[PDB]
Amino acid sequence: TPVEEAQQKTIEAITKAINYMAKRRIGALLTIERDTGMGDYIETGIPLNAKVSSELLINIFIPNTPLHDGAVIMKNNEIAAAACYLPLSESPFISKELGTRHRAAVGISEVTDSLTIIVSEETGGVSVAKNGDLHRELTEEALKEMLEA
Amino acid sequence: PTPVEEAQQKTIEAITKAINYMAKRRIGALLTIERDTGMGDYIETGIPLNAKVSSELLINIFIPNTPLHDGAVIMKNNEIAAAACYLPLSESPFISKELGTRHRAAVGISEVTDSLTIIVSEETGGVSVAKNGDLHRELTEEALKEMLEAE
Numbered sequence A: 001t002p003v004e005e006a007q008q009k010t011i012e013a014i015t016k017a018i019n020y021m022a023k024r025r026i027g028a029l030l031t032i033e034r035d036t037g038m039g040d041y042i043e044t045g046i047p048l049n050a051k052v053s054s055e056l057l058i059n060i061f062i063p064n065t066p067l068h069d070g071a072v073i074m075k076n077n078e079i080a081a082a083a084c085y086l087p088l089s090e091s092p093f094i095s096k097e098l099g100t101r102h103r104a105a106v107g108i109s110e111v112t113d114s115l116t117i118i119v120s121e122e123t124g125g126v127s128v129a130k131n132g133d134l135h136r137e138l139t140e141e142a143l144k145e146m147l148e149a
Numbered sequence B: 001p002t003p004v005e006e007a008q009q010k011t012i013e014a015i016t017k018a019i020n021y022m023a024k025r026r027i028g029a030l031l032t033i034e035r036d037t038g039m040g041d042y043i044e045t046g047i048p049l050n051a052k053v054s055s056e057l058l059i060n061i062f063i064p065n066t067p068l069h070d071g072a073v074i075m076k077n078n079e080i081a082a083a084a085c086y087l088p089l090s091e092s093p094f095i096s097k098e099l100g101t102r103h104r105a106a107v108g109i110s111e112v113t114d115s116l117t118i119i120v121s122e123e124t125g126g127v128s129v130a131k132n133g134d135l136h137r138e139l140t141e142e143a144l145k146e147m148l149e150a151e
């Protein structure tokens, strides 16, 4: 169906962008809104309401650029905003080597049903935050399965 | 002070902030503003964005060595319609010979549309505008803003 094709296109754009950033160890934070509305967080960023592309996602997260400091929030198959605030988790159960990107991802996952993707700037490692837990060192296939699920 | 007028003023402020930033950093850029001649055929050659304008997004688009930096951004009213778009190259003899493909593309689109195109040189940081087949170079910040305001 058109809806199914569009979802698969979006997943492909995301995974391509994440793979490129993982290879270059570009830190990134990408939250996908689900049933819990995230408007209050979207409003803290720079509005985009842009079509998804791997190219635009990569251009957003380039280091030392206006848009790379904060989270991208995606909603209804569009990039709603960039450079958004997310709340920092106070969980004591996050790997101690991780810093504020990962804590922000976990934090938003504590209070919403959203899925957040994190690329580490230290390692290029890819992780996902959902339900207050962080799933670390994901393969490409693992990330795709989480997005399909 | 209608909403349309205020939106235009916010868009002009975003463009001029981005162009000033890129000029200072010698970030090459090529930004075409559609007017009454539709540019769909050119917009369709790029990556679709259909994005709200911001100075931040414009700057990010043109950072060197990134996916979206080569080719034109085409704006439709208060949106960035597409990036990395193809524009036709002018063969005009009035294009300074030292200028590269971005300036020739800008003049080229300006020969077949009523659009206004802004160019930032990666060599000098100089700002130029192409309109109606003519290239106007070395614009001050004030002159660019006045040209945008008049357009």
Ligand SMILES: CC(C)c1noc(=O)[nH]1
Pocket (backbone or CB within 6 Å): A006, A007, A008, A010, A011, A032, A033, A074, A075, A076, A077, A078, A147
């Ligand atoms: C298809 C899915 C992963 C999605 N990505 O951004 C969205 O708004 N939905």
Ligand SMILES: [Mg+2]
Pocket (backbone or CB within 6 Å): B137, B138
């Ligand atoms: Mg002069």
